[PDB]
């Protein structure tokens, strides 16, 4: 999810992507680099090393980090010792940023002396060469010498990979082996309170920069936040350490001690070698959390006026607070929902000022929160106001957007606010907006956009939406190998450029269903794709070859598909049973091919795949998840998905066993659901205890599997659960718009509803949701990808997924997003009898 930032290349509506070598190496060394690892390996001579011994770590500050590798590595070659170091300055940053993992932070060079003797031998003569230098980050994993950047401790050298996941331990603190404890006592002997007035209960968070600690002042009982900043550790894009940031938080907290909204400074001192900022411990939630917990996501016809109250209250306080801050010449330089807190009585507080900057300064900040920023703002104070301006609309409609799409989605958003709230609240928002507009004009020449709401209208005609999204896709063909722009996964994942989920086949399949762009599709299939087939190892329905084979077969490439089918069993991944990428998805494809060709060899293969699924299930009951957005419940990556396979297999088999299995797999997924007490809506429960509606990981997925179970068998099982899931149609707003993870999921609800009067309401509800996202551009429609930061045309997040869902509604086909052979006939062919 944080990966998205890497794909916000300037001046594009699409997701597009934006060394420590030594001097004169002796031939006695083998050098291994890394397009994978952070480590640049140095193997010495020919002989390998002990599995575990005492190792030396060398840390280094930034100012001159090159002068510490130019020296230490050469004594690692004078004595001919084995070592490894970070690849590049870039890799240095990842290990030594605020963000970095403390466990192995600081570690720049790792030296491997064999054991005991050469270790102490080395550790001394290193410190003679690197003694006249700036100190680097202390490694909280190791022990230190004097004022030395030389560290040490015991651990494995070349970590084996075992059953429980060895790596032979590196922990946030210091440790001792129960084995070689004796030699530990040796070096012990060669090696040469202000916060005592606080009782530290617990720590909220730690980081590479330091901890944040809940403490009660010794005899006073006042709860305080204690913010640690250890020097030179936790670097910024700006190359500023934890300290420099802390002594900017300090300056600001005083300078606005008079503002009662701002957190109040208690004290600020030094200790061991660290620096501590003590502040007043505030109770409530950030606006992100407040929105998550308090926003009326479910549409009840008992009004939404309560929320209008609280928003108006919160925003006005915030308007005051920002004015106060700007009086004192300080801009809180990251104005966005994370940094605004709000107590149980809804008192607006600002808590972190590490990003504070003098208003009137035109310096690029270290950190920009996409969604609450614009490249138009060139001055610190104006950045605050723009933040607030966007935050204003956000509390009304909590749906992120980037500057690249804001030109479109402001229409959709503002129109939504009116249609759903009073005109009074619409006009409140739009006034407070323009109230911000020229608080900006104070700091900089800013000539704002003139918005007329009647220039964009929301669309509820399925044929119109499908037609216009198609015309969009046709107008948006890349002339390259991807065919369409899509999610970042086109670049991040194997086969992502070609597969059904994020690649060209998704669009080509969709365009084919709408009889559009035949020549463009034929060109892409012939010039690209067929040549890329041999390079896609994965067989997955969405992620790999099988979804592509569906496209290919429909388009007339029997010979290719039939040869692929011959190869399909022989080498088949068997650890994975999901619809996304495992045996269920493949099996579903294989059954569809059976139905189309009536070749009984495909039925046999389908039964072989089932046996593999049975085996996998027996082996262990833990599902394996490869995508970072994958969740082991529901239709895409869990057991509901596998039930799709059993149901389909049942249809071509008439064998009750498969039907009973289909049922059991749904039952199992239903155990991880939770019915809400107020609103009677059923959702799935994540492992992170998140509640999910979406097609990917959510209850809409489970409903689809119930529907298909019922479709093949002529039953009406799980009606109670079903009815509780269709109630999700009352959802207003979602984080994102896409079929898998966003609004598009909800389009699948109406396609499951038999009677029309009930359907038409549900359809209208879900089209209200779609219309937050559906972008009018030129004469046609396009669609925002994940987080509405850029447009996407793929199935996973973009317009192709929407089109398929919408055609699903028309056809009463909740399975229409699956890339199956034929598929216009699939329901008819799998129906009961």
Residue numbers in the entry: 4 to 21, 29 to 178, 190 to 213, 223 to 863
From the study:
In bacteria, Ser/Thr protein kinase-like sequences are found as part of large multidomain polypeptides that biosynthesize lanthipeptides, a class of natural products distinguished by the presence of thioether cross-links. We also describe the first crystal structures of a class III lanthipeptide synthetase, consisting of the lyase, kinase, and cyclase domains, in various states including complexes with its leader peptide and nucleotide.
The structure of this “leaderless” ThurKC shows density for the activation segment and catalytic loops in conformations similar to that observed in the structure of LP-(GS)7-ThurKC. However, a comparison of the respective C-lobes of the two structures reveals that the N-lobe of “leaderless” ThurKC is shifted away from the C-lobe. This movement opens the ATP and peptide-binding sites that are sandwiched between the two lobes. Although there are no changes in the orientation of secondary structural elements that define the activated conformation, the relative movement of the N- and C-lobes in the absence of the leader peptide shifts active site residues too far away to productively interact with ATP and presumably the peptide substrate. Many of the residues that stabilize interactions between the three domains are displaced and incapable for interaction in the “leaderless” ThurKC structure.
